[PDB]
Design a protein around this ligand. Structure first.
Ligand SMILES: COc1cc(Br)ccc1CC(=O)O
Ligand SMILES: COc1cc(Br)ccc1CC(=O)O
Ligand SMILES: [Cl-]
Length: 130
C-alpha cells in the first residue's frame, strides 16, 4: 500500500536524523568515511564487512532498511569491526575501540528514547509479510 509506503518513509527519515547526529559528532569523524586502502591496505583483507556512517546513509537511501533492528545490526558492525581490527593494548587502538563503541551506545541510547516501540513493531510486521 501507499500506508505502508508512508511507514518506510518515516523510518528512513528517522534513521537519517539519528545517523546525521552521530556524523556531526567530532568523536565519530573517523567513522564517517570508509577506510582508504592507502593508509590501511590490510584492512579490506581482515575486515570482511566494512561499515561506516556514509554507507549507512547510502543504504537508508536505497531503501535497504525496513526495520530499526536491521539498522542497528549495521551500527553493531562499526563497533565490532573496530574491536576486531584494533585490539592492541596501545592508546591508538584503545581510543578507536572506545570511540566505535560509544557510537554504538549513542545510537542505541537515541533509539531507546526516541523510537516508538509500536512503530518498530509495525515495520517488523509489514516486513515479515513481504
Ligand atoms: C555531515 O552530514 C552527514 C554526514 C554523513 Br557521513 C551522513 C549523513 C549526514 C546528514 C544527513 O544524511 O542528513
Ligand atoms: C535500543 O533498544 C531498543 C531497540 C529497538 Br530496535 C526497539 C526497542 C528498544 C527498546 C525501546 O525502544 O524501548
Ligand atoms: Cl583524532
Amino acid at each position: 500500500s501507499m500506508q505502508e509506503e508512508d511507514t518506510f518513509r518515516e523510518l528512513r527519515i528517522f534513521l537519517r536524523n539519528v545517523t546525521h547526529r552521530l556524523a556531526i559528532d567530532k568523536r565519530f569523524r573517523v567513522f564517517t568515511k570508509p577506510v582508504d586502502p592507502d593508509e590501511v591496505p590490510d584492512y579490506v583483507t581482515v575486515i570482511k564487512q566494512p561499515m561506516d556512517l556514509s554507507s549507512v546513509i547510502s543504504k537508508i537511501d536505497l531503501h535497504k532498511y525496513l526495520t530499526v533492528k536491521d539498522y542497528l545490526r549495521d551500527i553493531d558492525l562499526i563497533c565490532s569491526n573496530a574491536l576486531e581490527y584494533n585490539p592492541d593494548r596501545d592508546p591508538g587502538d584503545r581510543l578507536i575501540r572506545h570511540r566505535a563503541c560509544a557510537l554504538r551506545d549513542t545510537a542505541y541510547a537515541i533509539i531507546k528514547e526516541e523510537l516508538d516501540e509500536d512503530f518498530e513493531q509495525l515495520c517488523e510486521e509489514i516486513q515479515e509479510s513481504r
